[PDB]
Design a protein around this ligand. Structure first.
Ligand SMILES: CCCCCC(=O)O
Lengths: 122, 122
């Protein structure tokens, strides 16, 4: 669920997830996809495409189990959809951390998104 | 839609809507309802109950027309559902503005929603 996702992002980046990625660029946050503004935005692009492949569980609402082991996100076995969901969230958390070096606050807020260029199909 | 709602909140409060209310308390932004933490939170509680009365349109995606007349949100004549939807959004924007005096930053970027007490029926 959003709770686990946010927790992962905090654990990897050390940043408050809502504050930094709540509405970042054309792909981070509520709404759909759009042409990526930068590398960070592209992380969320991939993430939303990752969600599209899921069946059997709700990516926004459904809780799952994961652990923080030697500062690594380790997805619990859960079930098929929940584990795949967990791996989606782990991937974007890692991706966001790896692209902190080009994070730009000018993409942080907000109004942008409906005017974004339409995204390629996943 | 989300765009009209966000614009209304900005117009009334003068505040960045996603920033101030994206994850505020148990009722503002993402997720469902919960036991409200304060007056601002109650606005969002009422808002989501307002959405339940809606029959035929999508509060998240369906756009509607409104205008800014004498610094007042004025819902334009669309179909019945879109009119009710517009009035739901107008009400919460006004309510959030009215309760800026007790807005508490501690409730802001603080995803506490899974810990919220179960909301009573609308
Ligand atoms: C549009 C972002 C803030 C929404 C707050 C609420 O009406 O739930």
């Amino acid at each position: 669920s959003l709770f686990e996702l946010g927790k992962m992002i905090l654990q990897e980046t050390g940043k408050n997830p809502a504050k930094s990625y709540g509405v970042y660029g054309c792909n981070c946050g509520v709404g759909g996809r759009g042409k990526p503004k930068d590398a960070t935005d592209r992380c969320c692009y991939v993430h939303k495409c990752c969600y599209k492949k899921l069946t059997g569980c709700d990516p926004k609402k459904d809780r799952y189990s994961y652990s923080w082991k030697d500062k690594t996100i380790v997805c619990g076995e859960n079930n098929s959809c929940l584990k795949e969901l967990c791996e989606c969230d782990k991937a974007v958390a890692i991706c966001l951390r790896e692209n902190l070096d080009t994070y730009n606050k000018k993409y942080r807020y907000n109004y942008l998104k409906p005017a974004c260029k339409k995204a390629d199909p996943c």
